């Protein structure tokens, strides 16, 4: 299943049209699915909601035929960013085995927050295990996209670094790890190791030395 992009501003009204309009009398379901999480039944009948869904989630009933099914989100929050599916049942088409396509709502105009970089030196036990690891932890940044550079003393590293793609947090900010794997001797033969995290327009540095 492919994804349809959508962009509403914070506090506005979202109008998510169904990608598969009905041919007869319909019974449309709306599921809110955040990736890697449990889907949320927003609206099950054409217009009915379950217990625990805000009034600001509305779905169009079919009183007269011809009105296409749409999901309306009034007063959109940042937490309303998710996948939205249109489970279309109607009297003409068969059994709705497949859910909708995918409308991924991305809310514009959120507060920009700078990351919180924290670099840890290699552990004592793993250095005793003949393997070193620099762990540069980045969190609480928006918009979720950072570039990570590693400096050995003053030379760029690039070789032997893995970096996490910015996942989302419960506070609607983003987080990403960045592991630099060093040999225990390479870690001791250098003076300092820096982690450069350039978020949006600026870079932040966190350095660590073997002492």
């Amino acid at each position: 299943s492919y994804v349809r992009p959508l962009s509403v501003a914070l506090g506005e009204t979202a109008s998510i049209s169904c990608g598969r309009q009905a041919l007869g009398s319909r019974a449309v379901q709306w599921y809110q699915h955040r990736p890697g999480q449990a889907p949320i039944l927003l609206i099950y009948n054409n217009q009915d909601r379950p217990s625990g869904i805000p009034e600001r989630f509305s779905g169009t009933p079919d009183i007269n035929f011809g009105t296409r099914a749409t999901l309306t989100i009034s007063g959109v929050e940042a937490g309303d960013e998710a996948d939205y599916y249109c489970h279309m049942w109607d009297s003409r088409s068969g059994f709705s085995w497949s859910f909708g396509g995918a409308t991924r709502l991305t809310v514009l105009g959120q507060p920009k927050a700078a990351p919180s970089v924290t670099l840890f030196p290699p552990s004592s036990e793993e250095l005793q295990a003949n393997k070193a690891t620099l762990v540069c932890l980045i969190s609480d940044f928006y918009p979720g996209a950072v570039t990570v550079a590693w400096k050995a003393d003053s030379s760029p590293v690039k070789a032997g670094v893995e970096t996490t793609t910015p996942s989302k947090q419960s506070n609607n900010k983003y987080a990403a790890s960045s592991y630099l794997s060093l040999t225990p001797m390479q870690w001791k033969m250098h003076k300092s190791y820096s982690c450069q995290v350039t978020h949006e327009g600026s870079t932040v540095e966190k350095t660590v030395a073997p002492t």
């Binding site: 994804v3 004592s124 036990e125 690891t133």
Partner: protein
Amino acid sequence: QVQLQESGPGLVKPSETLSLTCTVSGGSISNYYWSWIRQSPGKGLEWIGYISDSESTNYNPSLKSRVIISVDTSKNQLSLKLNSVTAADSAIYYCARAQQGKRIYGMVSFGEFFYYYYMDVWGKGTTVTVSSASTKGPSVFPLAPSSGTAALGCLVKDYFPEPVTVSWNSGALTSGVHTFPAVLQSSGLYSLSSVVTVPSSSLGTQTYICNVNHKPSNTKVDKKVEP
């Protein structure tokens, strides 16, 4: 009310039976419909099949010739057995209660209705990865701070497959905790890093231990953190 919780091997070899189960709570197993839903990375929600309060079978033609959805009413338990798995079967498998709706438009006597199904309560999801690679336990390494507010955590090196569950002081330390998503290294093993922000004044009269669990390896390890 009703809640659900899935549980599975977490890792199944290619061309094998992917057994699974789901125990419901606060609800009777024999008076509702039950749906299985999986979701792979890059793919959308896929409806596996469903079983009725009459225990009737009906599967997605997509899979059809591989699924079998059983249910045992002695407990509140219902299973799911996909076989002949391939790489494309890696997904989070969800367990939701389907409720039957009957949409009438014309005359009920002339059969001018149709039946739809909506899932109102879901399970949390069980990750299942398929690969010939063997299981693997992690190896936690401490991450010590160095001085108002400071931070410390645990480095969960080289494990397979996803995921691992990180607790702090068996569940007591739950404020300020921040567990980061994993990293699939080119060696084929994930690595995770958890970290807690803590008032540095407590770093002397307060002990901190992280609780790491990785189910596919039957491992439960702990480690202290101190300067």
